[PDB]
């Protein structure tokens, strides 16, 4: 019952799997911009070229019990800075390149990813806009605690993101 | 007509006066609103969500603000040493300036209520050890060693089983408390496991927290 | 901020002629103006204050005038003891910004 | 006869302070006020500030708020001025002048 | 204490000065409507994404020295998309669809209300309500300096999507572009 | 009398303000209207032709 | 709109006019009041408590105001002598200026009602004797001796049994009465007991005492 | 006579002059709120310990000679803890949380009301409600001398703990610091 519903309320149907990011000790963070990053994926590849859909995202990390670290996943409606399946990399993870500090990032719906007790987390968010039929929201995954491990172990910890759209009206 | 005389206070403009003006466009129909998720009725909802404080604040960490989020614990620390100590006043500059609660308390003068502090252990899974979390009542003194901090409000935090606890500050007023983290047992690590762990501190306001007397900064 | 300058930079007037000097202000003081006589190596002294009344030791040859933002000082006639520079004064608001100064010569 | 006598010039190391005091005579000190004027090179005049020793209250120029400091002594009937953080362009000429009667207007004689 | 003071409505309720307009000895000044004009009331609205609010405006006219003169002025509202007046004698001032408010300086400040102007359901901060126009009536210049200040209140506040505040100082007006720590520092960890 | 103070917005003229004025002729009776074919209640009727 | 014409009295400020102003802070909630003991609804409650008058007022007692509180009685006094005589007007300067009643009557012009005067005997326990307390009606004359003061309102005060009595002044008005204390029997003292006693005078207003027409001093 | 005149409410009801402010040819004067300013209304409140009262203020503006000039002035209230303005052009005057009252000299005196400002349940006399600020609008000086007087009433009077009055004259303002007899004297005891 770790399902996190955003803001308390709720061949097209299938599980889309994005690329697996390599997350190392010296890394910073990654972010995806929905729907735009998903428009090139699968059935939506030829579909995008109005849309009303809810989004169910799953963030899973496969790591052994010998590592340590923590991530933070969140959903920020209308995230504007101040992109393909590769996403991008934040050059200033403290301000998230928004000029907005990282400590207050938890105001938005979030779930804590801790390599100790939990290997996976998910966030169910609905469609939120002033106009019902239309860069809706970005997905921010940044480590709070950097990775530390003894020599001889695996230096890269894969992070996968699977998108499962629910209640899609095109 | 009905005779009347103007009382004092006519022909003045008060900034806090709530009147009813004349609409510029009498026949304009605005766009009807629709249900938007994430609605907030009161600023109390923003204060109740948990946010990250900065316990690691130092002159050296200015170049790399990312290390400010968490504070280290290592095998070198012995039994009885003080890991971290910080006062909790939401308004004053310090560890509580980064949280959303401390920022919303800057627009207000008199605030009071109860608080909560949450810790998280990001360390390795096979690591075990105990940590003493003590709170000194307002107006007291800083605990000298571990044995003098046990007499007050305290909680035993063992991350070998429970990964987080909630420390409830009983009362605060502004017209402060002392949160200290003491070492109980040394950090136990096996071979191949990391010898250094980090602990992230979170905090959120409770329901009895009130605020008034708005003042801009 | 209150600011004012004089015109022109420097004058040359021999003994026995009329001297017309003016200092224009950006805002309007409506009242107060003063003129100071400063020679080389000595301190100024008061001559004409409030654009009209003249201080002690000043002869009738120095007379002020002007209203609003336009003021003037009429010297008739010039004597060999009048060599030096002139300044202007504004009491309108603090801080006080003095004049730029004007040098006198003999044709 | 009103006469105000100043002190002599001094040599100050940049970054240090300076003590400027000039005694007053020929009139009654406490009923009137005091003012200071700086003459910058080559030719310019600027009003440093003033002190009226009934309270004591004072007003300064916006740029001298963090430099000039004034104090008065009514026993010896003198007026003092302090300047700190002297720089290379701070070399100038200072004047000691008496103002009006509980007024800063009425240009000083 | 009750919950009425910390409510969303009372937080934006207090009035503020959103503009400063000065007319030297021009004749007309066009001022665009913006809530981002000053630091205050700006940081407050970036806490939220979607906001729906009515606008109340106040027109206060005076001189530089503060004295009032019996001079008649014109206060006109320009809806979004309407052409702006290029001069005092232009056609935009006689346009029937542009409302006008005729007030004097002795006339106490007039109060006008602007409804919700956006085609969407709410404003998006991350917003143009139109512009004003002000001139002195008559075909000749007025020998009086006019310096006016506009006060703006906010009525019927609605809020959605709470966002984290911006710790860094603002750079430009239209974009949230040397990183600064959001909190102070201390020499050690165990020091109070 | 009932005491009152003038609020801001007195002695102004708004072009979109709908008031009730004083009739110049209080006793004039206008010609009563009659049914005229081709009546239009709203501009939507002109757009639909 | 409803037509009306301004009647005379517009654009004026009256100091005694009770209006309703506009609150500066419309959304400020003040601290709710709590029950506080010692609440006073009306100034009549302060006038009804007993306070000490000054009957001993003299030019010699100016250096030591402590002796002003009480007046002496000694064995030297014979039968028929007048111990103390004072007029009672609450407003005028005199013995009634020290009491809280006389001070509250200074802020008011017209006052009337009934009064009460209480005496206390601090002397030795084995002492016995009688004292005559007489009150002359307003407009009369000062009693010459003891026998002429008995015809009026009087009370016999014997401190061998009853230590205090209450003398009720029937009526007072300001648009006075004469309270005299006469010696009935000589002061009787045994051996070893003090030969000099002191009597303290107290006074309090009754319920029918009214006041009006406030005037500052 | 009835009990309505001697009641606690009517004893503090009458208005009084709590301040005198004069502006020479400064520009701004900050006046702290105090009821201890003058001898009257002071001795009256020391009769009681705990007092809970609303404050009503009156702003009356005039010149030294009494004539009125059409000049616009600003009346601002500063809540406790807020910074005081250091000048006319400073930032404290544009602050949104500081209420302002814009009135002219021809405008009849404005009336404002201050609620109960103390964090406790009642005031303790044996008390700071904040301070004011007043300036003439505009970036330039006004060539008129302004001398204003502030009237203060008291609404909704509540009283507790009656205390004995102070017979000795007052020495300092903040402390009740040659003893004087509270009553007059006479040459003998038996004299009337």
């Amino acid at each position: 019952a770790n399902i996190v519903i955003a803001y308390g309320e709720w061949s097209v149907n299938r599980f889309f799997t994005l690329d697996t990011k390599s997350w190392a000790k010296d890394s910073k963070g990654w972010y995806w911009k929905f729907p735009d990053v998903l428009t090139e994926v699968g059935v939506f590849g030829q579909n995008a070229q109005l849309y009303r859909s809810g989004f169910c995202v799953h963030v899973q990390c496969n790591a052994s019990k010998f590592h340590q670290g923590a991530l933070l996943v969140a959903v920020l409606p209308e995230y504007v800075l101040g992109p393909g399946q590769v996403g991008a990399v934040l050059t200033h993870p403290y301000v998230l390149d928004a000029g907005i500090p990282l400590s207050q990032l938890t105001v938005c719906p979030h779930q804590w990813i801790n390599l100790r007790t939990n290997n996976c987390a998910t966030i169910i968010v609905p469609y939120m806009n002033t106009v019902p039929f239309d860069c809706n929201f970005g997905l921010l995954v940044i480590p709070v605690v950097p990775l530390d491990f003894n020599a001889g172990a695996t230096s890269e910890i894969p992070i996968t993101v699977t998108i499962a759209p629910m209640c899609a009206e095109f | 007509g009905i005779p009347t005389e103007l009382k004092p206070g006519t022909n003045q403009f008060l900034t806090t006066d709530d009147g009813v003006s004349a609409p510029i466009l009498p026949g304009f129909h605005p766009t009807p609103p629709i249900h938007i998720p994430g609605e907030v009725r009161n600023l109390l909802e923003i204060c109740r969500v948990e946010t990250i404080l900065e316990v690691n604040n130092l002159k050296t960490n200015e170049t790399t603000p990312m290390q400010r989020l968490c504070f280290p614990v290592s095998v070198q620390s012995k039994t009885g040493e003080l890991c971290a100590a910080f006062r909790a006043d939401p308004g004053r500059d310090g560890p509580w300036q980064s949280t959303i609660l401390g920022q919303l308390c800057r627009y207000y003068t008199q605030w009071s209520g109860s608080l909560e502090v949450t810790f998280m252990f990001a360390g390795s899974f096979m690591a075990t050890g105990k940590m003493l979390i003590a709170y000194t009542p307002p107006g007291g003194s800083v605990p000298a060693d571990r044995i003098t901090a046990m007499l007050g409000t305290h909680v035993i935090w063992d991350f070998g089983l429970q990964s987080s606890v909630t420390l409830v500050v009983p009362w605060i007023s502004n017209t402060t408390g002392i949160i200290t983290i003491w070492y109980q047992t040394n950090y136990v690590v096996p071979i191949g496991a990391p010898t250094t762990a980090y602990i992230v501190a979170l905090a959120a306001a409770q329901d009895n927290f009130t605020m008034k007397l708005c003042k801009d900064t | 901020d209150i600011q004012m300058t004089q015109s022109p930079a420097s004058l040359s007037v021999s003994v026995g002629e009329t001297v017309t000097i003016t200092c224009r202000a950006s805002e309007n003081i409506y009242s107060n103006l003063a003129w100071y006589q400063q020679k080389q190596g000595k301190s100024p002294q008061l001559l004409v204050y409030a654009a009209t009344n003249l201080a002690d030791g000043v002869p009738s040859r120095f007379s002020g005038s002007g209203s609003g933002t336009q003021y003037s000082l009429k010297i008739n006639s010039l004597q060999s003891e009048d060599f030096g520079t002139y300044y202007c004064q504004q009491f309108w608001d603090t801080p006080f910004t003095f004049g730029s100064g004007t040098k006198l010569a003999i044709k | 006869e009103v006469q105000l006598q100043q002190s002599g010039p001094e040599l100050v190391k940049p970054g240090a302070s300076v003590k400027m005091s000039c005694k007053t005579s020929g009139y009654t000190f406490t009923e009137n006020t005091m003012h200071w004027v700086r003459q910058s090179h080559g030719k310019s005049l600027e009003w440093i500030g003033g002190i009226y020793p009934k309270n004591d209250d004072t007003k300064y120029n916006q740029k001298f708020k963090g430099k000039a400091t004034l104090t008065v002594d009514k026993s010896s009937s003198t007026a003092c001025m302090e300047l700190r953080s002297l720089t290379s362009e701070d070399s100038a000429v200072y004047y000691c002048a008496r103002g009006d009667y509980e007024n800063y207007f009425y240009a000083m004689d | 204490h009750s919950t009425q003071e910390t409510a969303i409505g009372n937080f934006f309720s207090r009035a503020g000065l959103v503009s400063i307009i000065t007319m030297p000895t021009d004749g007309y000044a066009n001022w665009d409507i913006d809530l981002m004009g000053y630091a205050q009331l700006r940081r407050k609205c970036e806490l939220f994404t979607y906001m729906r609010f009515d606008a109340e405006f106040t027109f206060v006219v005076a001189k530089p020295n503060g004295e009032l003169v019996p001079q008649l002025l014109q206060y006109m509202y320009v809806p979004p998309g309407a052409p702006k007046p290029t001069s005092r004698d232009s056609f935009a001032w006689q346009t029937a669809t542009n409302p006008s408010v005729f007030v004097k300086m002795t006339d106490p400040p007039a109060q006008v209300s602007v409804p919700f102007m956006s085609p969407a359901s709410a404003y998006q901060w991350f917003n143009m309500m139109g512009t004003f126009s002000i001139r002195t009536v008559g075909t000749k210049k007025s020998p009086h300096s006019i310096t006016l200040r506009v006060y703006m209140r906010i009525k019927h506040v609605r809020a959605w999507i709470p966002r984290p505040l911006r710790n860094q100082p603002y750079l430009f007006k239209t974009n949230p572009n040397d990183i600064k720590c959001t909190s102070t520092s201390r020499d050690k960890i165990t020091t109070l």
Side-chain angles (χ1 to χ4, degrees), chain A, chain B, chain C, chain D, chain E:
Chain A
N2 62 345
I3 304 301
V4 176
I5 295 170
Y7 297 138
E9 63 183 342
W10 179 258
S11 296
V12 64
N13 189 340
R14 69 171 64 197
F15 295 160
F16 293 157
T17 299
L18 296 175
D19 57 353
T20 59
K21 300 299 183 181
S22 63
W23 180 82
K25 184 185 293 179
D26 59 353
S27 178
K28 293 177 179 177
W30 292 272
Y31 64 92
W32 291 273
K33 292 181 69 66
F34 297 161
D36 290 344
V37 63
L38 181 63
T39 59
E40 295 84 357
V41 176
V43 177
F44 295 160
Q46 70 284 359
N47 192 340
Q49 294 81 359
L50 59 83
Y51 62 92
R52 175 62 177 84
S53 297
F55 293 158
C56 181
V57 62
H58 301 289
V59 176
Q60 295 178 336
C61 55
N62 290 337
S64 63
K65 294 176 179 177
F66 294 159
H67 295 82
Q68 64 179 19
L71 297 174
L72 178 62
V73 62
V75 174
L76 276 67
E78 291 87 2
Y79 176 78
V80 176
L81 295 174
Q85 295 84 0
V86 296
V89 176
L90 294 173
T91 186
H92 299 291
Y94 177 77
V95 296
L96 300 175
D97 291 343
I100 295 170
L102 179 63
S103 64
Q104 294 178 336
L105 182 64
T106 59
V107 176
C108 296
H110 64 285
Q111 186 173 355
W112 290 95
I113 296 170
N114 189 340
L115 295 175
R116 183 179 178 86
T117 187
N118 192 29
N119 58 32
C120 57
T122 187
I123 294 170
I124 294 171
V125 60
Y127 176 79
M128 295 180 285
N129 190 340
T130 59
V131 176
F133 295 159
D134 59 352
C135 296
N136 296 131
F137 59 89
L139 179 63
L140 295 175
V141 176
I142 295 96
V144 176
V145 174
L147 177 63
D148 182 67
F149 58 90
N150 190 340
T154 301
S155 63
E156 295 85 358
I157 302 301
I159 294 171
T160 186
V161 175
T162 59
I163 295 170
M166 294 177 182
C167 296
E169 295 84 358
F170 295 158
Chain B
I2 295 98
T4 187
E5 182 67 14
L6 296 175
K7 291 180 294 297
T10 57
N11 290 337
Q12 66 180 19
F13 177 80
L14 177 63
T15 59
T16 59
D17 186 5
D18 180 67
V20 175
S21 178
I24 292 173
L25 296 175
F28 178 81
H29 183 197
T31 299
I34 61 172
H35 181 62
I36 302 301
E39 185 278 336
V40 56
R41 294 182 183 174
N42 188 339
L43 293 174
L44 296 174
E45 184 277 336
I46 298 170
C47 296
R48 291 175 296 180
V49 65
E50 61 185 343
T51 56
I52 297 170
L53 296 174
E54 305 304 319
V55 182
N56 193 29
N57 57 343
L58 292 173
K59 299 291 184 292
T60 302
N61 291 336
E62 183 67 14
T63 59
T64 59
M66 294 301 295
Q67 295 299 321
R68 189 185 296 273
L69 297 174
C70 55
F71 57 90
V73 294
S74 63
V75 296
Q76 184 64 260
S77 64
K78 301 302 287 185
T79 299
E81 294 178 351
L82 177 62
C83 183
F86 59 90
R87 295 181 180 274
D89 181 67
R92 66 180 296 176
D93 291 344
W96 291 89
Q97 187 174 355
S98 63
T99 186
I100 192 65
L101 176 63
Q103 294 299 321
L104 295 175
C105 294
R106 298 293 179 86
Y107 296 94
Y108 296 132
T109 299
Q110 294 178 336
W111 62 86
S112 179
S114 64
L115 298 177
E116 184 278 335
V117 176
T118 300
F119 293 159
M120 177 178 71
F121 179 79
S124 178
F125 177 80
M126 292 178 181
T128 187
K130 293 181 181 297
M131 296 298 293
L132 177 63
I133 297 169
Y135 176 78
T136 300
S141 63
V142 177
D145 58 354
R146 180 180 180 274
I147 61 172
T148 189
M150 184 177 285
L151 276 66
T153 299
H154 63 285
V155 61
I156 302 301
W157 181 82
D158 180 68
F159 58 89
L161 59 88
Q162 186 174 355
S163 179
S164 63
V165 295
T166 59
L167 177 63
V168 176
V169 176
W171 180 257
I172 60 172
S173 295
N174 189 340
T175 59
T176 188
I178 305 300
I179 295 171
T180 58
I181 296 170
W182 291 94
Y183 295 135
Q184 185 173 355
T185 59
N186 61 344
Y187 178 78
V188 176
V189 60
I191 188 65
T195 59
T196 299
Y198 296 140
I199 295 170
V200 177
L202 276 67
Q206 291 298 321
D207 59 9
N208 58 32
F209 179 80
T210 59
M211 64 197 87
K212 61 180 293 180
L213 183 60
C214 183
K215 183 178 179 180
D216 58 352
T217 58
Chain C
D1 187 5
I2 187 67
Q3 186 174 355
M4 67 178 287
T5 58
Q6 298 179 337
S7 63
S10 178
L11 277 68
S12 179
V13 176
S14 295
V15 175
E17 291 82 357
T18 300
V19 176
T20 59
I21 188 65
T22 59
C23 51
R24 181 183 295 177
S26 62
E27 289 82 357
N28 190 340
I29 186 169
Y30 295 95
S31 296
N32 292 336
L33 178 65
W35 292 90
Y36 296 140
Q37 181 66 60
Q38 185 174 355
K39 295 181 181 297
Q40 183 64 260
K42 291 181 295 297
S43 296
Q45 69 283 0
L46 177 64
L47 274 65
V48 175
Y49 63 91
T52 58
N53 190 341
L54 58 83
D56 57 352
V58 175
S60 63
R61 294 180 295 102
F62 296 161
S63 64
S65 63
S67 296
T69 188
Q70 296 300 321
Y71 295 139
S72 64
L73 177 63
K74 298 293 180 64
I75 295 170
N76 190 30
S77 296
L78 188 146
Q79 294 300 321
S80 178
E81 296 84 357
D82 290 344
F83 60 91
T85 188
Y86 295 141
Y87 297 134
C88 290
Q89 184 64 58
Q90 57 184 19
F91 291 158
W92 180 252
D93 57 352
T94 186
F96 297 160
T97 299
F98 299 160
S100 63
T102 299
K103 301 302 287 185
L104 295 175
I106 305 300
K107 291 187 297 296
Chain D
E1 185 278 336
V2 174
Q3 183 64 259
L4 275 67
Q5 183 64 259
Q6 294 178 336
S7 63
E10 296 301 321
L11 177 63
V12 177
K13 180 66 175 172
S17 178
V18 64
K19 180 63 174 173
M20 179 66 181
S21 179
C22 49
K23 63 189 183 70
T24 60
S25 64
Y27 63 93
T28 181
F29 178 80
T30 187
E31 291 80 355
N32 291 337
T33 187
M34 179 67 180
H35 295 289
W36 292 92
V37 171
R38 180 179 181 273
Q39 184 173 355
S40 178
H41 299 290
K43 301 300 287 185
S44 64
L45 272 67
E46 188 278 338
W47 181 84
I48 296 171
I51 183 66
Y52 178 73
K54 189 178 179 180
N55 192 340
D56 298 346
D57 58 352
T58 187
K59 60 178 66 180
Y60 298 139
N61 190 340
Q62 185 63 59
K63 60 180 293 180
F64 293 98
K65 299 298 183 181
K67 290 182 294 296
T69 299
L70 275 65
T71 187
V72 296
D73 181 67
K74 62 180 180 296
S75 64
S76 63
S77 65
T78 188
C80 296
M81 177 180 72
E82 185 278 336
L83 178 63
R84 65 183 182 276
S85 65
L86 276 67
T87 58
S88 63
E89 70 280 4
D90 289 344
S91 296
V93 176
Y94 297 140
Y95 296 139
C96 292
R98 55 180 290 273
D100 193 6
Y101 177 67
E102 67 271 2
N103 191 28
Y104 299 141
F105 299 160
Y106 178 76
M108 299 179 285
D109 188 6
Chain E
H1 183 62
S2 178
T3 188
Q4 63 180 19
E5 183 67 14
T6 186
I8 305 300
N10 290 337
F11 181 79
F12 292 155
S13 178
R14 293 183 182 175
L17 179 63
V18 296
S19 178
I20 294 171
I21 294 171
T22 300
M23 293 178 181
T25 59
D26 291 344
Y28 62 92
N30 291 337
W31 180 85
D32 292 344
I33 295 170
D34 55 351
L35 191 144
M36 294 291 99
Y38 295 138
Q40 294 300 321
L41 181 63
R42 180 176 181 171
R43 185 180 179 86
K44 294 176 179 177
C45 294
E46 293 179 351
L47 178 64
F48 297 151
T49 299
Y50 296 142
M51 180 173 174
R52 184 178 180 85
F53 61 93
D54 290 344
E56 185 279 335
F57 295 156
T58 299
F59 177 81
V60 176
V61 62
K63 290 181 68 66
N65 61 345
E67 292 177 350
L68 296 175
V69 174
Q71 184 64 59
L72 178 62
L73 276 67
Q74 185 173 355
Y75 176 78
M76 181 178 284
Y77 176 78
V78 175
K84 295 176 180 177
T86 59
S87 178
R88 58 175 182 181
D89 291 344
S90 63
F91 178 80
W93 291 95
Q94 294 178 336
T95 301
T97 189
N98 291 337
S100 296
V101 176
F102 295 160
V103 295
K104 294 181 181 298
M105 293 179 182
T106 59
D107 187 5
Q111 294 177 336
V112 296
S113 178
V114 175
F116 179 81
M117 295 296 103
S118 178
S121 178
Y123 295 96
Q124 295 178 336
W125 294 98
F126 295 160
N127 58 32
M128 177 178 71
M129 294 178 71
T131 188
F132 295 157
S133 63
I134 295 170
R135 67 178 180 88
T136 300
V137 297
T139 59
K140 292 179 179 179
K141 302 300 286 186
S142 178
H144 299 290
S145 296
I146 295 171
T147 299
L148 61 86
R149 291 192 297 274
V150 176
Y151 296 137
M152 178 174 175
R153 291 195 296 272
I154 296 171
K155 303 299 182 181
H156 300 290
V157 178
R158 296 295 180 190
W160 291 276
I161 308 301
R163 297 296 299 277
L165 294 174
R166 183 178 180 85
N167 64 345
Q168 295 300 321
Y170 297 93
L171 275 66
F172 297 96
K173 301 293 183 291
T174 59
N175 190 338
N177 296 131
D178 186 5
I179 58 173
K180 179 62 174 172
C181 55
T182 188
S183 296
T184 58
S185 177
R186 57 178 182 182
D187 59 353
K188 292 166 62 181
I189 296 170
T190 59
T191 187
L192 296 176

